Amino acid sequence: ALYEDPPDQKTSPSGKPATLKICSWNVDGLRAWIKKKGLDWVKEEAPDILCLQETKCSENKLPAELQELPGLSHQYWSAPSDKEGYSGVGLLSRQCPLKVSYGIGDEEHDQEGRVIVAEFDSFVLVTAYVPNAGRGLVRLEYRQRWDEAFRKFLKGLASRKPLVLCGDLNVAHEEIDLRNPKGNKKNAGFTPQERQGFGELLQAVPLADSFRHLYPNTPYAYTFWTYMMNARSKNVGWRLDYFLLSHSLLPALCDSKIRSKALGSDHCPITLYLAL
DNA sequence: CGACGGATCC
DNA sequence: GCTGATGCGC
DNA sequence: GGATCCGTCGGGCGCATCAGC
Ligand SMILES: [Cl-]
Ligand SMILES: [Mg+2]
Known part of the structure; x- marks a missing residue:
């Protein structure tokens, strides 16, 4: 089934306005993503903080476009040696x-x-x-x-x-958290071992899953689709991307979004609104 | 990793 | 320099 | 015999390297 993320809730449960917008995105090759207009989408989203994964790019090779972001001027990069x-x-x-x-x-x-x-x-x-x-x-x-x-x-x-x-x-x-749970229990991303590890992460730190906190019973909400077999067009996907929060931040949680429509990767962006 | 072919279940 | 093939991993 | 369970298989992506020219 297809999925439509609900409208942005920009107010906390007690009525306080969001003050902080964070966006996270596995871009599957930063240079490719920029050529596929990913930064145009970031500009429209206008987050206060942007976190990127799978940049596949050392800092010397960052496109100049990244220097043309006045609203995100403090930038920190890491790549494996x-x-x-x-x-x-x-x-x-x-x-x-x-x-x-x-x-x-x-x-x-x-x-x-x-x-x-x-x-x-x-x-x-x-x-x-x-x-x-x-x-x-x-x-x-x-x-x-x-x-x-x-x-x-x-x-x-x-x-x-x-x-x-x-x-x-x-x-x-x-x-x-995925379209095909039965078929993927022996595949990367949905082994019992990895699922257990996630459960242990939440319990040990401890942390809450912001999206599931707000939408505990909402199916078909995914952040990744394999490029294979036109999976994204069928919304055959996995929720791999999270905002996990300390318990003390739950009163500040306004919304946790899945930006299904934003292209440029095999993951889509996720966005968090906090009232701090 | 979703599509597929084959086996098993009631 | 530039293309396209292969290797590797996602 | 429709639904389910399970193992096997082919292939989209990006980026580094290589061969050729
Ligand atoms: Cl840096
Ligand atoms: Mg990936």
Whole structure:
């Protein structure tokens, strides 16, 4: 079945206006995405903070267009040292963060280009591109060990400010989160192991899934569709992209959006409105 | 990873 | 420099 | 025998490298 995201709720449950708009997008090759007009869409969305995953681009190769974003002038980029044509993440912000760091503990030695942490006045933002279990699950055990290291890292953050974790967490948590649950239980993104890891992430940190909090029983809401077999035209998809929030931020949560119509990748953007 | 062919279930 | 094939991973 | 369950298979994407010219 097709899906139509409901209108933007820009007011909190207690009536407070949203003050912060965050957009996250796995762009599947930043340079390709820009050629497919992805930045034109970003300009229309006008987020305060933009988080990008799978940039597949070292910072020296960023298109000049990215320098022509006055409203997102503070930009932080990370790419793996070994395999530059893969992974890569970015965080772009209207206001300058207080602190920016990279990775989950040892990036200076294992520069993976998957995680950026930025502290702002009232909250800490983490964006992540979680490692894929791979075709045939050949890297599933590495993904499980990474999941564990990531949980521990997030739990270990020194700041007492609430956390927003966003990005491509590369798992459909529950059956409602993809079109073909039965057929994919032995595929990357929907193994019991990855689902369990997501459940453990939520419990251990702890975090709430902003979209599912607001729309607990809404099916056919996806953020990824394989380029194969015209899957997007049939809305045969997976919800892989999340905004996860500290419990203390739920009163500030206005809406969590899925921007189904925005093209340029095999993922679509997601957008968060907070009243801070 | 969705499409497909084959087997199994009541 | 530029194209298109192959390799790799998503 | 329609629905379900399950394993196998071919192929869209982007980017790096390579061969050729
Ligand atoms: Cl940077
Ligand atoms: Mg991808």
